[PDB]
Amino acid sequence: GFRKMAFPSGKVEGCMVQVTCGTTTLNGLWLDDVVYCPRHVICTSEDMLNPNYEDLLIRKSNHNFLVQAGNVQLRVIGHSMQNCVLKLKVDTANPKTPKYKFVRIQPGQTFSVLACYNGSPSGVYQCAMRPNFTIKGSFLNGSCGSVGFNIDYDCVSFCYMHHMELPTGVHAGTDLEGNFYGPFVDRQTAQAAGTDTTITVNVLAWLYAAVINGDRWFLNRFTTTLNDFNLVAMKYNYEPLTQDHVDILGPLSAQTGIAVLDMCASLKELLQNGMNGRTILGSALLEDEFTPFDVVRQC
Amino acid sequence: GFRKMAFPSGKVEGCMVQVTCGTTTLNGLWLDDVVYCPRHVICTSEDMLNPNYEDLLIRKSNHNFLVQAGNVQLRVIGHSMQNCVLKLKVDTANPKTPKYKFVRIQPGQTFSVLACYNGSPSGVYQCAMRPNFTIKGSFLNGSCGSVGFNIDYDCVSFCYMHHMELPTGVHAGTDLEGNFYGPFVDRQTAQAAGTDTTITVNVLAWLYAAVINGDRWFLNRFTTTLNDFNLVAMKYNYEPLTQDHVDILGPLSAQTGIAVLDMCASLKELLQNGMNGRTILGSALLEDEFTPFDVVRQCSG
Numbered sequence: 001g002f003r004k005m006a007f008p009s010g011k012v013e014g015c016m017v018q019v020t021c022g023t024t025t026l027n028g029l030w031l032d033d034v035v036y037c038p039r040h041v042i043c044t045s046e047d048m049l050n051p052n053y054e055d056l057l058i059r060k061s062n063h064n065f066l067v068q069a070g071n072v073q074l075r076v077i078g079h080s081m082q083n084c085v086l087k088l089k090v091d092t093a094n095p096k097t098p099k100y101k102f103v104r105i106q107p108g109q110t111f112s113v114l115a116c117y118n119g120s121p122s123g124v125y126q127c128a129m130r131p132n133f134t135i136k137g138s139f140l141n142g143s144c145g146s147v148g149f150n151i152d153y154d155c156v157s158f159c160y161m162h163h164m165e166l167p168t169g170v171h172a173g174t175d176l177e178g179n180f181y182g183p184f185v186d187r188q189t190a191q192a193a194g195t196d197t198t199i200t201v202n203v204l205a206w207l208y209a210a211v212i213n214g215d216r217w218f219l220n221r222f223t224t225t226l227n228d229f230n231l232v233a234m235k236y237n238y239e240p241l242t243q244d245h246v247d248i249l250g251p252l253s254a255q256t257g258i259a260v261l262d263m264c265a266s267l268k269e270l271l272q273n274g275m276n277g278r279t280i281l282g283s284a285l286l287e288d289e290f291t292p293f294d295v296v297r298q299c
Numbered sequence: 300g301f302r303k304m305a306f307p308s309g310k311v312e313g314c315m316v317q318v319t320c321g322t323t324t325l326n327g328l329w330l331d332d333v334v335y336c337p338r339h340v341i342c343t344s345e346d347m348l349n350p351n352y353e354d355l356l357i358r359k360s361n362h363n364f365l366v367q368a369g370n371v372q373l374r375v376i377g378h379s380m381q382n383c384v385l386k387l388k389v390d391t392a393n394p395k396t397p398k399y400k401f402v403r404i405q406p407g408q409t410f411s412v413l414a415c416y417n418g419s420p421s422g423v424y425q426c427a428m429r430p431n432f433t434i435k436g437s438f439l440n441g442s443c444g445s446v447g448f449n450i451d452y453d454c455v456s457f458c459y460m461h462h463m464e465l466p467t468g469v470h471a472g473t474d475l476e477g478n479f480y481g482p483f484v485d486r487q488t489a490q491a492a493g494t495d496t497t498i499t500v501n502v503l504a505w506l507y508a509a510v511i512n513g514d515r516w517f518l519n520r521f522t523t524t525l526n527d528f529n530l531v532a533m534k535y536n537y538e539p540l541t542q543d544h545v546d547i548l549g550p551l552s553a554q555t556g557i558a559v560l561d562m563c564a565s566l567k568e569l570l571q572n573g574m575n576g577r578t579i580l581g582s583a584l585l586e587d588e589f590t591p592f593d594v595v596r597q598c599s600g
């Protein structure tokens with residue numbers, strides 16, 4: 001079987017706390033003796049339209065920030081801002097801090113999201129960083145400060161902290177240095193993203209997964225050159241396929257004995273014609289949020 | 300705009316161990332001072348055919364079971380079989396035991412699966428129990444003893460433990476009392492699931508979700524009796540509704556003001572007339588793996 005699968009979230013759950021300033025409550029990430037959270041916690045309703053964050057922050061003191069780990073209040077003993085993230089220093093070290101790192105993820109890569117409300121983990125699911133630097137998440141009021149991450153041999157690599165929803169229903173946020181993915185800004189305004197394109201290497205990986213699990217109706221005897229495929233992909237707002245993508249797809253091609261460029265010819269046929277009302281792995285749409293690595297770690 | 304979203308898995312990660320008999324290792328669930336696992340851990344390859352589980356267990360002693368949390372051995376001090384699960388009493392109460400209960404779910408209900416290998420969690424994902432009592436998992440060799448669960452507040456309701464794969468590639472297993480869902484047995488034989496059907500109650504929940512988000516073209520000005528709807532539904536390979544299904548749609552019916560039986564009438568028209576190229580929540584396909592609880596969780600909670 002083949003399933004969209006999130007990393008086990010326990011190591012991140014032990015880091016989630018609630019952060020409150022004024023009438024605004026969201027989540028923070030508590031690592032060692034620092035809590036990281038979105039800086040817009042310091043805004044009021046009036047501030048959010050055009051917040052001068054440095055000016056709003058100079059007027060705050062440590063005691064204006066209320067941090068709670070469950071029933072326990074953590075004393076804030078220091079605070080600073082790094083881009084769009086606030087760093088609150090507390091007197092307590094988190095005993096549950098995992099081995100971790102902060103990474104900035106590349107578009108087309110996937111990560112797990114731990115959606116939290118009031119410092120309490122609520123759900124976990126897989127997202128991809130879109131080419132237009134949005135993510136198609138599930139985030140409601142109070143979800144800010146929820147984080148996205150990957151796990152590699154007990155090391156948690158944090159890559160995303162949640163800040164906002166766009167009018168189209170997609171989501172935007174920062175890495176853990178507080179820099180946004182994409183052209184977005186943490187102010188209460190309607191923001192549009194650039195035109196979103198489809199992650200072609202991931203669509204190919206998912207077709208290979210549909211073949212492994214016995215689904216073949218889309219394949220064909222034909223083939224294509226890399227450049228000719230990429231001309232058709234760009235026409236249909238698919239990202240171009242690089243030679244590294246082809247290389248990355250090697251293991252999957254070998255396992256199924258289907259040349260990458262033969263799978264490209266199949267995808268070309270799908271783009272030009274369609275599904276014909278049919279489905280692949282249950283879906284009526286081409287799925288582009290599985291990476292080659294994601295697929296390999298499942299067959 | 301809906302994601303299949305699992306529950307946070309940490310409270311279950313803290314209960315996973317491995318159980319080995321000879322060279323056969325699967326996963327177990329450590330709650331208080333008991334470890335629960337599939338009884339077929341006591342089988343060799345040649346026993347799998349039609350194992351004599353009672354005979355195989357009589358040859359076993361406490362000191363034949365290797366239970367490990369990580370690389371740390373947990374001493375077994377008692378063993379018993381309950382249906383298709385082994386219960387291994389150990390000398391240490393799990394300090395990470397959550398508040399928990401053991402529940403038997405119904406077809407259509409969803410749950411999170413924490414897929415594990417050698418006692419180590421690998422991934423978490425949502426499954427729906429199909430009307431034919433299979434789930435569409437992603438289970439590899441060594442995954443048996445992985446569990447499915449829901450979390451309500453801080454209480455973990457364990458509802459599934461994994462035992463086997465069927466010829467068609469779907470998966471089968473038991474509740475935490477060892478009772479299989481559906482008509483399967485833990486023998487290494489080709490077993491067939493009944494033909495699957497569409498989970499009507501979840502499709503209705505999906506229509507309610509569509510209405511909540513302002514997508515309501517399919518609502519009509521008619522109603523139906525539950526029996527009339529069930530007889531039509533069966534002709535389209537949809538499950539009949541139970542009284543419990545009607546009741547668990549109550550909150551969404553109240554939220555939208557659309558009576559359950561009126562929504563049934565709208566669904567009946569979709570089944571008889573098709574979608575006519577229209578879409579619902581952006582798709583021409585009716586989704587059947589979001590329960591009414593799942594819908595409320597992503598729309599309002």
Ligand SMILES: *[C@H](O)[C@H](C[C@@H]1CCNC1=O)NC(=O)[C@H](CC(C)C)NC(=O)OC[C@H]1C[C@@H]1C1CCCCC1
Nearest residue numbers: 139140141142143144163164165186187188189190
């Ligand atoms: C933080 O918890 C919250 C998470 C959002 C709320 C609903 N779903 C989410 O993911 N983030 C916000 O509320 C940000 C805060 C600003 C200061 C960055 N703003 C936001 O998400 O607004 C939602 C945009 C649709 C709204 C616009 C409509 C037109 C007027 C301006 C807002």
